[PDB]
Write a protein that binds this ligand. Structure first.
Ligand SMILES: CCn1cc(CN2[C@H]3C=C(c4cccc(O)c4)[C@](C)(C[C@@H]3C(=O)OC)[C@H]2C)cn1
Length: 285
């Protein structure tokens, strides 16, 4: 047991992920060159990641001291931000996959569909949809003291009359509606996309547009794959704990889930040429 490992990971996230996501958002907002629908979805992803990053110093307290000293309102805000990030990230990735599928397999409709204004509207709709869980976490979140160890715990406060089916039902619903169905949609979309790419890879000829499409599809696929492997262990662990060394695995899964918020810019800078150019221009004008 050495507390500086996960705490150092949390601090590295708290600084680097915040800086990178802020740079991504600033670059997307400023440059008219990079105001594209996929870039708008990337902006939403970076916004969620930066929002979840600000709560990193509060997250590390329940690991350093195993108690919540920040109060009820801060507990509510932190829980709401966590649920907002979890739902918004997966929904935005699903919409990115759908947009890529439309661009690749239905170019006739993608002209009307893939305008940046529709991307902004879809981002607002995604934030509103996830608010059904964020506002619920605001209402239900709270701090309850432990009567056996005098430890303050920050968690959702289901009625103590049942507080059992409630927790299991909410965990199952979160699993189904934030992991299973969106991942199924992403898998279907990318299976069709890969089929289309293989079909025309032999003799496609619109060099500039084909290259651009294949590069953005690559970038989106890599981002989705990184998210899936970063958030897969925590979902399975939560489901197993609800239904069925353990604490070490739990905290490792939690830490791995949070590090995904910092790897998005270090992926954009390597998978996209325009993002790399803009990062260089900002760092070294
Ligand atoms: C600092 C360590 N710590 C974190 C917590 C609680 N968090 C972690 C686990 C949860 C979760 C995740 C997936 C499915 C599910 O049903 C619940 C949260 C809703 C999101 C956090 C996370 O995993 O994002 C990497 C939240 C209550 C308690 N201690």
């Amino acid at each position: 047991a050495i507390p500086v490992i996960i705490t150092a990971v949390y601090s590295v996230v708290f600084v680097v992920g915040l800086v990178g996501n802020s740079l991504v958002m600033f670059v997307i907002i400023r440059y008219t060159k990079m105001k594209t629908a996929t870039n708008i979805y990337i902006f939403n992803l970076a916004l969620a990641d930066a929002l979840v990053t600000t709560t990193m110093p509060f997250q590390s307290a329940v690991y350093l001291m195993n108690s919540w000293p920040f109060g009820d309102v801060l507990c509510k805000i932190v829980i709401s931000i966590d649920y907002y990030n979890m739902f918004t990230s997966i929904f935005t990735l699903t919409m990115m996959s759908v947009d890529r599928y439309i661009a690749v397999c239905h170019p006739v409709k993608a002209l009307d569909f893939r305008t940046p204004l529709k991307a902004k509207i879809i981002n607002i709709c995604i934030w509103l949809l996830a608010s059904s869980v964020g506002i619920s976490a605001i209402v239900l979140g709270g701090t309850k003291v432990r009567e056996d160890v005098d430890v303050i715990e920050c968690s959702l406060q289901f009625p103590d009359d049942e507080y059992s089916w409630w927790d299991l039902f909410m965990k199952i619903c979160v699993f189904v509606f934030a992991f299973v169905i969106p991942v199924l949609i992403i898998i279907v979309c990318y299976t069709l996309m890969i089929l289309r790419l293989k079909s025309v890879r032999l003799l496609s000829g619109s060099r500039e547009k084909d290259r651009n499409l294949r590069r953005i599809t690559k970038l989106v696929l890599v981002v989705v794959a990184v998210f899936i492997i970063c958030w897969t262990p925590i979902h399975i662990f939560i489901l197993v704990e609800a239904l069925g060394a353990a604490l070490s695995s739990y905290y490792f899964c939690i830490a791995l889930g949070y590090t995904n918020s910092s790897l998005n810019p270090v992926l954009y800078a390597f998978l996209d040429e325009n993002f790399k150019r803009c990062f260089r221009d900002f760092c070294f004008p």
